[PDB]
Amino acid sequence: LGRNHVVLFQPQIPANTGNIARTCAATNTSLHIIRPMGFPIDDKKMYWDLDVHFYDSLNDFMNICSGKLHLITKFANKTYSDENYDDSEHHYFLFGREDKGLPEEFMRQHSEKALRIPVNDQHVRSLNLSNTVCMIVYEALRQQDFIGLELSHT
Amino acid sequence: LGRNHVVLFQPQIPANTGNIARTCAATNTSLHIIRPMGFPIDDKKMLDVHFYDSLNDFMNICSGKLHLITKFANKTYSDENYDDSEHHYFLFGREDKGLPEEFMRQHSEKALRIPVNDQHVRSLNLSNTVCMIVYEALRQQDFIGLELSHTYA
Numbered sequence: 001l002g003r004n005h006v007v008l009f010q011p012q013i014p015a016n017t018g019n020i021a022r023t024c025a026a027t028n029t030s031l032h033i034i035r036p037m038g039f040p041i042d043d044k045k046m047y048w049d050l051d052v053h054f055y056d057s058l059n060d061f062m063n064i065c066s067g068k069l070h071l072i073t074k075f076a077n078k079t080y081s082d083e084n085y086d087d088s089e090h091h092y093f094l095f096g097r098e099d100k101g102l103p104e105e106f107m108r109q110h111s112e113k114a115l116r117i118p119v120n121d122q123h124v125r126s127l128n129l130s131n132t133v134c135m136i137v138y139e140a141l142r143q144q145d146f147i148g149l150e151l152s153h154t
Numbered sequence: 155l156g157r158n159h160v161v162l163f164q165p166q167i168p169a170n171t172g173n174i175a176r177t178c179a180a181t182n183t184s185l186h187i188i189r190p191m192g193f194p195i196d197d198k199k200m201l202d203v204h205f206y207d208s209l210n211d212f213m214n215i216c217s218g219k220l221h222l223i224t225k226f227a228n229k230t231y232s233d234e235n236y237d238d239s240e241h242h243y244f245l246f247g248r249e250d251k252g253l254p255e256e257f258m259r260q261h262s263e264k265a266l267r268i269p270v271n272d273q274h275v276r277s278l279n280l281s282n283t284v285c286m287i288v289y290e291a292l293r294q295q296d297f298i299g300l301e302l303s304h305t306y307a
Contacts, residue, residue, distance in 0.1 A: 023282060
């Protein structure tokens with residue numbers, strides 16, 4: 001049964017990853033992480049540890065990914081909200097590192113899958129990563145009539 | 155000329171306010187803050203920004219459509235229509251306490267929620283909520299506010 005998935009490539013900032021986990025828990029979104037993370041996992045610093053999967057590499061995730069993949073990038077020639085999420089597919093939303101983005105070779109192979117969040121680049125060139133995850137996940141939900149919210153048990 | 159505005163009621167967490175400022179700068183969104191903030195402004199720790207002594211002072215100066223972002227509104231943020239030429243003000247409560255009790259009741263017809271499944275968490279992070287609410291307005295407005303930096307200035 002089709003659902004939404006967030007895929008973080010080598011997440012570098014702890015606070016962004018904790019906010020993403022919270023958005024995933026709130027939305028019944030699965031979380032996928034490509035190792036290595038840029039930070040140590042500190043038990044004490046931290047409670048609902050949601051559907052989480054780890055992968056050694058992008059290639060590793062790609063052998064196991066089944067459905068529609070969307071690359072979130074700065075320079076895609078398509079806007080996030082113009083993609084159609086209103087189907088029964090699994091949707092995977094892949095986000096680059098805060099500092100480096102996604103590998104440029106991967107972006108090239110998959111360029112037709114890339115979507116951007118438009119910004120005016122006058123003062124800042126980018127939005128905070130966890131902010132982008134939340135809005136991308138909720139745009140998919142919006143088009144899906146928020147049905148993922150109702151389907152925790154299933 | 156119609157613009158989007160973010161209004162923060164007594165924001166309490168510095169990292170939230172710094173992220174909101176970034177979103178505002180990226181989107182040509184004006185930022186309004188009801189004093190007092192829960193944290194000191196530290197210049198070494200480091201945009202159209204306005205400050206207000208109180209919700210009342212903001213309400214005397216507010217002109218356009220006001221939307222209260224709350225947990226329990228009987229309307230979904232994305233079902234409000236933002237596709238007009240009005241100023242849209244999006245008012246967000248404190249991270250810890252939300253919006254005042256009496257204000258919410260007085261303005262309950264203006265309230266919108268972001269639906270969540272409350273099984274594991276009851277809320278989303280404040281700055282995440284600002285960013286999505288602003289971009290939902292932009293989406294309905296065909297992203298036009300991105301193009302009007304100089305005109306708004």
